[PDB]
């Protein structure tokens, strides 16, 4: 109910109406896991080092 009421205070995009705590009213992103990618498992890091 309170989440719905918070959305009632806005009549715009889902991201803008969401009001994330870290601001970022627009969260445009291209691709999947562009920055995080896949974490190098332990043996890969050890081999690289």
């Amino acid at each position: 109910n309170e989440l719905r009421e918070e959305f009632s205070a806005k009549e715009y995009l889902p991201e803008t109406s969401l009001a994330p705590p870290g601001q970022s009213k627009v969260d445009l992103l291209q691709g999947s896991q562009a920055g995080s990618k896949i974490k190098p498992t332990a043996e890969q890091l050890a081999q690289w080092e």
């Binding site: 291209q30 691709g31 896949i38 190098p40 890969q44 890091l45 081999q47």
Partner: protein, 246 residues
């Protein structure tokens, strides 16, 4: 009530009025806010503004008369206004720099990161000269097969075997992978070198952060060298018949 025709820009009689007025507007902003010092140590809030290319600026600024010095001064002044700690900037600076930011971002897709297949083997295809080679690399012991035959039977020259093994040697993993080469086309060296290139490509799937080591080793670059066509009026390409002075 009387009306008369006058130019837009105060620089209408200058060489390049458009660029001059844009720089004038930027200079007014830069001198109205001579305070608000620059950013601290960089690498945290820099190298994020793409600005605008020479061509993209010309269509809105100097155009044909756009000068290299004019562009350098423009970007220099844009950088100076960008280099203000964000928690003191105001809407005027940001609003004026919005135009020069431009929607430089371009959507990207179709990456298709390579992954191990159902049997845990990496499949890659290299090439050289007239050759091709599809290689299945799966972890194990240092066993290799070319077209179903042994390495020594297929490749008499030991240099071809050394080239094939180099990728597995750049990274010290010579005795940890099983190679199943299926080269076709060209002669022995082209086949061997296409196998080596395919092996280097296949090893990346196993440890993606080993790409640079291979790239610096030069095994990840494709050898574009190939036979050049026999030119019409002369002998075998780049050779001519004897030329007689008299």
């Amino acid at each position: 009530l009387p009306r008369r025709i006058v130019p837009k820009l105060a620089t209408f009689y200058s060489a390049n009025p458009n660029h001059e007025d844009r720089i004038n507007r930027l200079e007014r902003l830069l001198r109205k806010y001579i305070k608000l010092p620059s950013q601290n140590n960089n690498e945290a809030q820099q190298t994020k503004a793409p600005w605008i290319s020479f061509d993209e600026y010309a269509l809105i600024g100097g155009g044909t008369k756009l000068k290299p010095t004019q562009y350098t001064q423009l970007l220099y002044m844009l950088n100076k206004l960008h280099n203000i700690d964000p928690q003191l900037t105001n809407d005027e600076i940001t609003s004026e720099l919005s135009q020069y930011y431009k929607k430089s971002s371009m959507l990207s897709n179709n990456i298709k990161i390579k992954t191990l297949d159902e049997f845990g083997r990496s499949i890659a295809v290299g090439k050289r000269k007239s050759s091709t080679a599809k290689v299945f690399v799966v972890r194990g012991t240092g066993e290799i097969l070319v077209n179903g035959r042994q390495l020594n039977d297929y490749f008499l020259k030991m240099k071809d075997r050394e080239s094939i093994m180099y990728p597995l040697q750049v990274i010290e993993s010579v005795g940890k992978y099983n190679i199943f080469a299926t080269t076709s086309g060209g002669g022995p060296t082209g086949q061997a070198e296409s196998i080596m290139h395919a092996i280097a490509k296949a090893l990346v799937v196993f440890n993606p952060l080993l790409k640079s080591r291979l790239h610096k080793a030069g095994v990840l670059t494709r050898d574009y060298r190939h036979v050049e066509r026999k030119k019409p009026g002369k002998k075998k390409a780049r050779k001519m018949p004897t030329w007689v002075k008299r």
